[PDB]
Structures are given as structure tokens and as C-alpha cells.
């Protein structure tokens, strides 16, 4: 029994051990209550504005579209405190934890951005934060691990399974299954068991709401399409939500194509995986033929979630949103292009979204189109990866 539908069509649900059902019910009730509470809303708005820095800019990128009939804006989540969109919803989830009387936070992280966001919110709001991270990710993300530790969080390497994000996800749920009376699980994407896909969408929806207001002010109409990269689906659903009922507005989600879809080395389960049940939800998965969960591959660390949020799978199924993929090489060309032509260093994750927008433009340069790319993070973290690739290429 729940207050809200746990499914988006056939996707989603609450596939957790029975022991965790009271925790999910409690969280759902607290969320529904908070959404009607003006004091909660005011506290959340205060943090978003005065701490995180909302609203974020909407930047018109003139140089990269010169000579075409594309007009391209970037929604600047890269300018949010922490350097990515992840900050928005951790502030909301931290307030929910407090609302429920909890003083401890559990979080999973892959690339480390969600871990950093969880740590900073916990530091600000006086919560004790513990973060699970696959040991392979710990090894390759020492800057983020150190950021989390500077902010007083405990970072716990996970050695089980593949020692990556899915394994961290499992460990977080194992912990929660024995600690939910005192700890809140601050899940980092619009996936997992209900009510997380719903909560994360609502706590990221200011992205799209601001974009709508900003584009109306600047252009006097809605965009032809909004475009966002899709790991688990939080930044994309945050951009998409407020436009779902505006049926003229295209919603384009970009999954990582990795080395190419045909190689199998990608992270595009929504379009190229198979529906399974894992991490508390029924959704498209990266998985073996006999149903073992597999890793996602991308040049971009943050597109490693081996599934996708159920609302994305649903919006795809009904034809409301369209999902595409972009390869490592395409994402890299987009990264270099934005740096050189706009002076903005984009996260390799959102470089996938930008690459798809550039393709929309270049393929049909005389098509009139007003596009918004969600620039969900800054790319300072990625300059080492990019350096190493360019050096190997003999570009430098």
C-alpha cells in the first residue's frame, strides 16, 4: 500500500527485501507531506538560492552555431555549488532526512560527484555521512574521495562483486536494511525503488522550470527540444519534467555509446539493453544473457549506472521522449569544441548531450531549431582524462 503509484507504466516498482518496505513507506509519506509544507519549501528554496546559488544562468552559445539556423542555449548547472546538478536534490533529501528525525546519511557514488554532493549537504546540515564507493572507483577517483573526506564524510570502499557503482548501490541498501530507523539513504539518481524516481525528479525539476522561464523571456517561445545526458536519469528528468505537458517540446536523452553500440562496450541500456529487475526496480539493464548484472562503459565516469530510471523507460515507451547515443569520440569532439569556441569546459557526461545537439545542427544546418542542452556539470575534473587521450593520439 502506497500513497503514489510506484510504477510508470510497466517500469519501476519497489523490488526490495521485505525488511526495507517500512523505510520506503516512511520516506514516501514524508515526501508527500513535505511537498505540501510551505516551511519545508521555503527552507529548500533558501538553501538552493543562498547556498547553492540558484537560479543558474541560461547561456546563449553563438560561436558554435554560427552560419546555421540552430540557436543553442546551455542551462548552466555547471555553475551550481559543487559543480554539478547533483547538489539540488541532495539538499532536498537532506531536509527530508531531518523531517523524519534522522541524523545519519548513507549514499552511493560512482564517479564521486554524488558522494561529494552528499558530503557537502551533510556537512552544512549537521548530518553524519557515510558513502559507499566501489574500490575500483575509489582508486580512480582520489580527488573526489579526498573532497568527501575533507567535508567529514566516511568513504567506505566496496570490494564485493565488480567493485564498481552497482556494488556500491548494493552495499548502501545492505546498510540501510539494518539502519533505517536512524539513517536516510540519499540515493543519487532518478532510479531505484519507489519513491526515489519521483522524489529525485521533483527535487531536480527547478532545472526545467527555470529553463522554461528563461527561454520565454529571451526568445518569447518554448524550445524545439531540450537535450540531456542519461546515466541514471536525474539531470535529464530534472530538465524534462516541466516540459512533459508541452507536447511541442522535444525531450531528447543521450545515453553513452562508449566504443560503439555494436562493440557491446557502452552504457545505453534503455535503447540497447534488456529489461530486468535490480536495484529495487523493473527497468532496462546492462546484463548477461543469463541475467547477471553488468557494468556500463563510457569514457565519462559519471555515466556508469548500469540501468536507467523507470520514468525514462516509460516516456520512451509512449513516444513522449526520444533516446539516442553518443560515442566516446563524439563526446570528446564536443568537449574540445565548447572549450575552444565558448570558453566553457563541460563535464564529459554532458559533453554527450552537447555532441548530440551539434549533430542535430550539423546534419541539417538550414533547419530552424531552438535547442537547450542541460550542462549538468563542469569539466575541470576531466582535463586529466582528456589530456591523456590527446597525448596518446599525438594531438599533443
Amino acid at each position: 500500500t502506497t500513497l503514489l503509484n510506484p510504477y510508470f507504466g510497466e517500469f519501476g516498482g519497489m523490488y526490495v527485501p521485505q525488511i526495507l518496505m517500512p523505510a520506503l513507506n516512511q520516506l514516501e509519506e514524508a515526501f508527500v507531506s513535505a511537498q505540501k509544507d510551505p516551511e519545508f519549501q521555503a527552507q529548500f528554496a533558501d538553501l538552493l538560492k543562498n547556498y547553492a546559488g540558484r537560479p543558474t544562468a541560461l547561456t546563449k552559445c553563438q560561436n558554435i552555431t554560427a552560419g546555421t539556423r540552430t540557436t543553442l542555449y546551455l542551462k548552466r548547472e555547471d555553475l551550481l555549488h559543487g559543480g554539478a546538478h547533483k547538489t539540488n536534490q541532495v539538499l532536498g533529501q537532506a531536509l527530508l532526512a531531518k523531517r523524519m528525525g534522522k541524523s545519519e546519511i548513507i549514499a552511493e557514488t560512482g564517479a564521486g560527484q554524488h558522494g561529494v554532493a552528499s558530503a557537502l549537504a551533510s556537512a552544512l546540515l549537521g548530518l553524519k555521512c557515510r558513502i559507499y564507493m566501489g574500490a575500483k572507483d575509489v582508486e580512480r577517483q582520489s580527488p573526489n574521495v579526498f573532497r568527501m573526506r575533507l567535508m567529514g564524510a566516511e568513504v567506505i570502499p566496496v570490494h564485493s562483486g565488480s567493485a564498481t557503482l552497482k556494488d556500491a548501490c548494493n552495499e548502501a541498501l545492505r546498510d540501510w536494511s539494518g539502519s533505517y530507523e536512524t539513517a536516510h539513504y540519499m540515493l543519487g539518481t532518478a532510479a531505484g525503488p519507489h519513491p526515489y524516481p519521483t522524489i529525485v525528479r521533483e527535487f531536480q525539476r527547478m532545472i526545467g522550470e527555470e529553463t522554461k522561464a528563461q527561454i520565454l523571456d529571451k526568445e518569447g517561445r518554448l524550445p524545439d527540444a531540450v537535450i540531456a545526458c542519461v546515466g541514471g536519469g536525474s539531470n535529464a528528468i530534472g530538465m524534462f519534467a516541466d516540459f512533459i505537458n508541452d507536447t511541442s517540446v522535444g525531450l531528447i536523452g543521450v545515453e553513452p555509446g562508449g566504443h560503439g553500440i555494436e562493440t557491446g562496450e557502452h552504457g545505453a541500456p534503455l535503447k540497447h539493453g534488456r529489461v530486468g529487475i535490480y536495484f529495487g526496480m523493473k527497468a532496462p539493464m546492462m546484463q548477461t544473457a543469463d541475467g547477471q548484472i553488468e557494468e556500463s562503459y563510457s569514457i565519462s565516469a559519471g555515466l556508469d549506472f548500469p540501468s536507467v530510471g523507470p520514468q525514462h523507460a516509460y516516456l520512451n515507451s509512449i513516444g513522449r521522449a526520444d533516446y539516442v547515443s553518443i560515442t566516446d569520440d563524439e563526446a570528446l569532439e564536443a568537449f574540445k569544441t565548447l572549450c575552444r569556441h565558448e570558453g566553457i569546459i563541460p563535464a564529459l557526461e554532458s559533453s554527450h548531450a552537447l555532441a548530440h545537439a551539434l549533430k542535430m545542427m550539423r546534419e541539417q544546418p538550414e533547419k530552424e531549431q531552438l535547442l537547450v542542452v542541460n550542462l549538468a556539470g563542469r569539466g575541470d575534473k576531466d582535463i586529466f582524462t582528456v589530456h591523456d587521450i590527446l597525448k596518446a593520439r599525438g594531438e599533443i
Partner: protein
């Protein structure tokens, strides 16, 4: 078949609890796993709970995480596990065989087809660890169509509605969870469960087996004294495998001693 029904009736006649070990199929390899299982039976196991190796066993603590990993290191697949189950049944006619599954392995090639294969090899029950009662409908329906008992979890903090649901929908046995958290011998249950046991009986539930953190004879006896039909022990058994990987001989000897002692604790 009626393997659990027959077992519990026979144990009732002997005023006896059931002792039910868990192991991971194919840990530490197929041939040794088969020998392990035969030893468990010979030493006094009344029924078995058998795990199919899964990549993401999110209800299991480190001991059983590591069992899954050992089976994968040996190349064990679900298909091989079903071959093992067929042979186990071909050797042992009456012992109830329960599987511990995760949802993706059941759903992967079709829920109905999964349960049809269980019936074909002679499995008696399936517990899907990450499917709560709320999501159970297609699983329990497929189970019953194929003569498989769907095993439901009764948590320590069960409300009356949940008790009534588990009682109504379940067959074979009701899993009486010792405590919150995940599997592991290092964490003993700290709550009296006799009230839950009494309500389950009132509601005509399948007989209760207590599970999680059971590692000692006194806990088996306590389960019986509290009114449960018996007790399940996994991590404590798997620890013996882990400890003795280098000596299959000593492994089987220690498994036999442990199971014998745990089974003795169930007797009137």
C-alpha cells in the same frame, strides 16, 4: 508434491524441529558443492536452502557475498545450478529443496518458465529475496501453477495486515526473520518472536522457520521452544567452507560435526 507438508507432519510426530542449512550452489566448485550437500543431508539436514550465484546479492552479508564470488570464480552458471538441482533430487526423494533467488534470475528468461524448470528438476520452494509481498503476485502465481511453494518473509516488525498476507499467500514454510539487516553469523537476533509465531498459527500460515544469524545449537532449541517449526543456518555453514577451502576432507568433517550438533538441538 507435498514435501514440506510431509516433513513437518513427520517432525510433529517426533516432537522435533527442522534444521535447514543454506549453501551457495557450486561453492567452491560443482563437484565439491555436490559432496557438501550430500554431507549436510547425511549429517541430519531436514531440508535445504540453496542459493543460485548472483552478481548482486543485496540481502546477503560478506560471508555469503564471498560464497557467490567463489562460485563465479569456478564459472558456475544458473544452467549448471539447475543441472545440480536435478541430480540432488535424483539422489534424495523426500527432502524439501528450497531455492534462494534474486528477482532478475527469475524474471530473466520469463517468470513462468523459471518456475516450470524448478518443477521439472524437483524443487519444492522458491524465496525471492528482493520481492516483497507488495510485488509478489506474478511470482507466487507462477510458483503455485508449477507446484512450487512461494516463501514469504515475516519481518520482526510485521503489522497485522502483513501477517495476514504472508499467512494467506505462502506455502511450504513461513520465513521468520530474526532481525533487520542482511545474512550473517556475526549478528544474532535480539527480539522475542513468539508473538509473531502465535499470530502466524492463528492465521493458518505455513509453519515458521527462523532465519538470520542462527549459528549455535542453543539458537535452534530456542526457535523450537518459541513455537517455530525449526531454524535455518547459512553463514555459519558457509564459514566452514571458507575456512577449509584447502582441505576438502577437513571441510566435510567439520560440516558433518556442525550439522549433527545443530540437528541434535532440534530434537525433543
Amino acid at each position: 508434491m507435498e514435501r514440506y507438508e510431509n516433513l513437518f507432519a513427520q517432525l510433529n510426530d517426533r516432537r522435533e524441529g527442522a534444521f535447514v542449512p543454506f549453501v551457495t550452489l557450486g561453492d567452491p566448485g560443482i563437484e565439491q558443492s555436490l559432496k557438501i550437500i550430500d554431507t549436510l543431508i547425511d549429517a541430519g539436514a531436514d531440508a535445504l536452502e540453496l542459493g543460485v550465484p548472483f552478481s548482486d546479492p543485496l540481502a546477503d552479508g560478506p560471508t555469503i557475498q564471498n560464497a557467490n564470488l567463489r562460485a563465479f570464480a569456478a564459472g558456475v552458471t544458473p544452467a549448471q545450478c539447475f543441472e545440480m538441482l536435478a541430480l540432488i533430487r535424483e539422489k534424495h526423494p523426500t527432502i524439501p529443496i528450497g531455492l534462494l533467488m534474486y528477482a532478475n534470475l527469475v524474471f530473466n528468461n520469463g517468470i513462468d518458465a523459471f518456475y516450470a524448470r524448478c518443477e521439472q528438476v524437483g524443487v519444492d520452494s522458491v524465496l525471492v529475496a528482493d520481492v516483497p509481498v507488495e510485488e509478489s503476485a506474478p511470482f507466487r502465481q507462477a510458483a503455485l501453477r508449477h507446484n512450487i511453494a512461494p516463501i514469504f518473509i515475516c519481518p520482526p516488525n510485521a503489522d497485522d495486515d502483513l501477517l495476514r498476507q504472508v499467512a494467506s499467500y505462502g506455502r511450504g514454510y513461513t520465513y521468520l526473520l530474526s532481525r533487520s539487516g542482511v545474512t550473517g553469523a556475526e549478528n544474532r537476533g535480539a527480539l522475542p518472536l513468539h508473538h509473531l509465531i502465535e499470530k502466524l498459527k492463528e492465521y493458518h500460515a505455513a509453519p515458521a522457520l527462523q532465519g538470520f544469524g542462527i549459528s549455535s545449537p542453543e539458537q535452534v532449541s530456542a526457535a523450537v521452544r518459541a513455537g517455530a517449526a525449526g531454524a535455518i543456518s547459512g553463514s555459519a555453514i558457509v564459514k566452514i567452507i571458507e575456512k577449509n577451502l584447502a582441505s576438502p576432507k577437513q571441510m566435510l568433517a567439520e560440516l558433518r560435526s556442525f550439522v549433527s550438533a545443530m540437528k541434535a538441538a532440534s530434537r525433543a
